[PDB]
Design a binder for this molecule. Structure first.
Ligand SMILES: *[C@@H]1O[C@H](CO)[C@@H](O[C@@H]2O[C@H](CO)[C@@H](O[C@H]3O[C@H](CO)[C@@H](O)[C@H](O)[C@@H]3O)[C@H](O)[C@H]2NC(C)=O)[C@H](O)[C@H]1NC(C)=O
Ligand SMILES: *[C@H]1O[C@H](CO)[C@@H](O)[C@H](O)[C@@H]1O
Ligand SMILES: *[C@H]1O[C@H](CO)[C@@H](O)[C@H](O)[C@@H]1O
Ligand SMILES: *[C@H]1O[C@H](CO)[C@@H](O)[C@H](O)[C@@H]1O
Ligand SMILES: *[C@H]1O[C@H](CO)[C@@H](O)[C@H](O)[C@@H]1O
Ligand SMILES: *[C@H]1O[C@H](CO)[C@@H](O)[C@H](O)[C@@H]1O
Ligand SMILES: *[C@H]1O[C@H](CO)[C@@H](O)[C@H](O)[C@@H]1O
Ligand SMILES: *[C@H]1O[C@H](CO)[C@@H](O)[C@H](O)[C@@H]1O
Ligand SMILES: *[C@H]1O[C@H](CO)[C@@H](O)[C@H](O)[C@@H]1O
Ligand SMILES: *[C@H]1O[C@H](CO)[C@@H](O)[C@H](O)[C@@H]1O
Ligand SMILES: *[C@H]1O[C@H](CO)[C@@H](O)[C@H](O)[C@@H]1O
Length: 339
């Protein structure tokens, strides 16, 4: 059993070259050089990684990731008082991932099996924070993401959790202040989100689904969570002219507070809302249970833009969204639901 401590301005290099001799790696006030990844890929099974002090990154216009981890039976945690500081205002230019500077993604959680990431505190990511991909039985718990400075400083596309090609991922106790989706499930199965607080972004989203070889979303649950001061609350987006499926999606015991645009929005014409919704990505067995909240007077309570026949078997129990306009543009609403 070995414990390895890496720190300072050359910590990232040493960690990379010695990671496989370390049972435990502690990362203390590591300053990652510009244009380079903190490469924690391919750790030995059972390795424990502890973030300590303040982790920082040199400035460069590149696409990331800033941190990358992969392997099995890993524990990665944060020590008391630590933070991982992206100092994103260096890149923030109002354009996020769409244009302006090239901005690096923060945390590649790829090819993780049976691992836990707990207690990390991330501050001011340049753009998206967690990219979860190709991972199985991953728990992300008590993660704090504070991009609140981005609200008035050009923060854009600062998604907290982007999930794809993953199964059995559990997210609990997340606290997010950001400017895009709190969660986006692009594809994946058996996803559980609970005890979350999402402020400032675009809601808890399924989507966008379709147009990739990975286009199935199944068995996802959002429960006991608050979405506040966000553009949308509950959201399902499927890409127009694409095929896939979304099934067994549940939102339960959700509080929506001061939603700006849409309390609940389901769009089967995502990508081109001037066109009629298409029917290639059926949304079935969608359940809302005890979902309550308020939309500002200028927003819309509920928008359902379904394709003909491509939305069915919805159950909406104890749902109440008020404060906003009732939409008159809803299409092909299933029997259990309403705008
Ligand atoms: C729909 O997704 C649900 C959430 O992933 C899933 O429930 C989860 O089921 C797994 C079993 O595959 C449970 O996990 C395992 O780990 C615990 C301890 O780590 C063991 O005690 C279990 O025996 C098992 O090995 C999860 O605990 C459970 N998660 C929760 C929050 O319920 C459902 O199984 C999925 N439903 C369908 C029909 O597939
Ligand atoms: C690296 O150095 C630190 C001292 O801060 C220890 O915590 C650890 O055991 C390792 O030797
Ligand atoms: C961080 O800490 C290590 C020892 O833990 C030093 O080797 C390094 O120079 C920096 O002070
Ligand atoms: C990284 O750069 C620092 C800061 O100058 C050094 O002290 C360290 O040993 C490494 O070269
Ligand atoms: C980063 O720096 C460490 C220590 O200087 C080297 O071992 C590594 O190969 C890379 O140059
Ligand atoms: C990173 O840390 C290792 C082990 O402390 C050093 O050997 C290397 O020079 C770099 O500073
Ligand atoms: C991290 O850095 C070390 C040397 O700096 C490499 O050996 C490793 O492949 C990774 O690039
Ligand atoms: C990685 O870290 C180990 C442990 O300090 C060194 O022995 C190795 O040379 C590399 O710097
Ligand atoms: C913990 O892990 C390291 C390498 O992963 C071993 O060298 C050590 O003996 C213990 O198994
Ligand atoms: C490395 O060291 C830490 C503290 O000793 C452990 O938590 C871990 O299991 C591994 O042995
Ligand atoms: C990281 O990026 C900065 C800015 O381009 C360079 O100065 C540095 O040498 C490294 O490539």
């Amino acid at each position: 059993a070995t414990t390895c401590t890496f720190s300072g301005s050359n910590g990232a290099s040493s960690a990379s070259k010695s990671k496989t001799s370390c049972s435990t790696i502690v990362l203390s006030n590591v300053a990652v050089p510009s244009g380079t990844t903190l490469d924690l890929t391919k750790l030995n099974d059972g390795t424990h990684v502890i973030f300590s002090g303040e982790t920082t990154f040199g400035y460069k216009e590149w696409s990331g990731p800033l941190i990358s981890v992969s392997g099995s039976d890993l524990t990665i945690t944060g020590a008391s008082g630590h933070s991982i500081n992206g100092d994103g205002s260096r890149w923030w230019d109002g354009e996020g991932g769409n244009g302006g500077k090239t901005k690096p993604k923060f945390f590649a959680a790829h090819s993780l099996t049976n691992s836990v990431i707990s207690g990390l505190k991330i501050v001011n990511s340049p753009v998206q924070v967690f990219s979860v991909a190709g991972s199985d039985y991953l728990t992300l718990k008590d993660i704090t993401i504070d991009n609140s400075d981005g609200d008035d400083n050009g923060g854009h596309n600062t998604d907290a959790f982007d999930i794809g090609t993953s199964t059995y991922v559990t997210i609990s106790g997340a606290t997010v202040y950001n400017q895009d989706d709190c969660v986006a499930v692009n594809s994946g199965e058996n996803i559980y989100f609970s005890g979350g607080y999402c402020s400032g972004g675009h809601g808890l989203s399924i989507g966008s689904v379709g147009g990739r070889s990975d286009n199935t979303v199944k068995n996802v649950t959002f429960v006991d969570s608050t979405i506040i001061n966000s553009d949308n609350g509950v959201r399902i987006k499927t890409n127009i002219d694409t095929t896939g499926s979304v099934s067994d999606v549940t939102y339960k015991d959700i509080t929506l507070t001061s939603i700006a645009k849409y309390g609940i929005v389901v769009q089967q014409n995502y990508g081109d809302t001037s066109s009629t919704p298409t029917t290639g990505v059926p949304i079935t067995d969608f359940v809302l249970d005890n979902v309550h909240g308020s939309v500002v007077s200028s927003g819309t309570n509920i928008l359902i833009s379904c394709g003909s026949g491509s939305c069915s078997d919805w159950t909406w129990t104890d749902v109440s969204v008020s404060g906003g306009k009732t939409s008159s543009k809803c299409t092909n609403v299933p029997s259990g639901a309403s705008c």
